[PDB]
Design a protein around this ligand. Structure first.
Ligand SMILES: *[C@@H]1O[C@H](CO)[C@@H](O[C@@H]2O[C@H](CO)[C@@H](O)[C@H](O)[C@H]2NC(C)=O)[C@H](O)[C@H]1NC(C)=O
Ligand SMILES: *[C@@H]1O[C@H](CO)[C@@H](O)[C@H](O)[C@H]1NC(C)=O
Ligand SMILES: *[C@@H]1O[C@H](CO)[C@@H](O)[C@H](O)[C@H]1NC(C)=O
Ligand code: NA
Ligand code: NA
Ligand code: NA
Lengths: 189, 16, 180
């Protein structure tokens, strides 16, 4: 479609620190790609982000019932919605699937890769460590970083650059809040 | 016990 | 220092006359409101057992967003949106094993306006069995994220494509996937 488009977009953001002890409420307004005005709970009033948000800064700050509503949002809206979903969002725990497989080097390099895939876990906070005969490998460890799957799960690929020698035992160790003791998958040449 | 998510109500912009 | 972030993201677009209302928690959709049906649609069905949402609140907000769009369009001297094309990434839910169920993920990121046509292509042919998708998810800036899914049975024979259509792209973007 060639026809021109006009977009009005709004985000009402609740930022939580130390549970609900410290909250930052952000009422943002966007026109097309431009954020024009916003309400910051720290500021306590509406402020124009650009020139286009100036009539809203003057008008929304004079609307006393609307300004008091925004000032009370940290408790009546932010803290309230945190509690409503707490058991299945904040406290949500999905245990990971740990897969260890050898990989081909791109192209022929001195070292081959040993991939530790950690999938289907929640939350995002995870510790993935590589071991060589009980000793932790700190060098030659390559990670794709944290991959969000968009379905309340995460994944990560933690590679080890090594030469399969001696008859060694390689071990990937996984630590996640969903499990009490670290998870391990052993691999041998 | 309120197990309901609350909507942050929207207000009409300035027509000036 | 930030622990968690809850975002209520809402939009209205002209001339399409289409709106959307959703709640986001740490980048994940909690729920969205079905504008046509006047229904709350939970991302994971267990969410509806512990929490609830009155869909009327979302629709009342959308009427205001529409009115605000009308005002903002006039205020900007009728300036249309500059289309930002998306970055498309195709991946799997887990490592690939032959004849073992897996999920293909199509991640569409950094785009505006929030309008796409996403078709999954198995050997160049469209597939709709088991397909699922998120709504237009919020980002730190003015741009949008979206996830599309295709549950599949891995084979050496079968090849895959995610065809994404956006007004910022001159040609429909096809991101390919195949075994090894
Ligand atoms: C998504 O799909 C529809 C078609 O099914 C697109 O709408 C068409 O766009 C072209 C412009 O080149 C027109 O010729 C048609 O009249 C439109 N058809 C309909 C039914 O509206 C739409 O543009 C696509 N959306 C995106 C973002 O690409
Ligand atoms: C978190 O909140 C409590 C309130 O009693 C306080 O004791 C504690 O110091 C806070 N922790 C941090 C890291 O700020
Ligand atoms: C719209 O046009 C007028 C001309 O009088 C001008 O004041 C203003 O800068 C324009 N607004 C924008 C957002 O470009
Ligand atoms: Na951890
Ligand atoms: Na309930
Ligand atoms: Na609700």
């Amino acid at each position: 479609d060639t026809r021109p488009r006009f977009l009005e977009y709004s985000t009402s953001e609740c930022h939580f620190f130390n549970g609900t002890e410290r909250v930052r409420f952000l009422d943002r307004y966007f026109y097309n790609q431009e954020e024009y005005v916003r309400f910051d709970s720290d500021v306590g009033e509406f402020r124009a982000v650009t020139e286009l948000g100036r009539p809203d800064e003057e008008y929304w700050n004079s609307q006393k019932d609307f300004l008091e509503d925004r000032r009370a949002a940290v408790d009546t809206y932010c803290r309230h919605n945190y509690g409503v979903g707490e058991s299945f969002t904040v406290q949500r725990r999905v245990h990971p699937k740990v897969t260890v497989y050898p990989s081909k080097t791109q192209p022929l390099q001195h070292h081959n890769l040993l991939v530790c895939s950690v999938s289907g876990f929640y939350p995002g906070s995870i510790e993935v460590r590589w071991f060589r005969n009980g000793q932790e490998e700190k060098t030659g460890v390559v990670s794709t970083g944290l991959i969000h799957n968009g379905d309340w799960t995460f994944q990560t690929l933690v590679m080890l650059e090594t030469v399969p020698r001696s008859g060694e035992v390689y071990t990937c160790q996984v630590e996640h809040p969903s499990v009490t003791s670290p998870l391990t998958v052993e691999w041998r040449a | 016990v309120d197990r309901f998510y609350k909507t942050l109500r929207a207000e009409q912009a300035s027509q000036e | 220092k930030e622990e968690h972030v809850i975002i209520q993201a809402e939009f209205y677009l002209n001339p399409d006359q289409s709106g959307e209302f959703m709640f986001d928690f740490d980048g994940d959709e909690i729920f969205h409101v079905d504008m046509a049906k006047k229904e709350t649609v939970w991302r994971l069905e267990e969410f509806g057992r512990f929490a609830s949402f009155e869909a009327q609140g979302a629709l009342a907000n959308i009427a205001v967003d529409k009115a605000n769009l009308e005002i903002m369009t006039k205020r900007s001297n009728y300036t249309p949106i500059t289309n930002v094309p998306p970055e498309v990434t195709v991946l799997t839910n887990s490592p690939v094993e032959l004849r073992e169920p897996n999920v293909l993920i199509c991640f569409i990121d950094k785009f505006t306006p929030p309008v796409v046509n996403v078709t999954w292509l198995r050997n160049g042919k469209p597939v709709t069995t088991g397909v699922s998708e998120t709504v237009f998810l919020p980002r730190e800036d003015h741009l949008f994220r979206k996830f599309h899914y295709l549950p599949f049975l891995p084979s050496t024979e079968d090849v895959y494509d995610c065809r994404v259509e956006h007004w910022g792209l001159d040609e429909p973007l096809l991101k390919h996937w195949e075994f090894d």
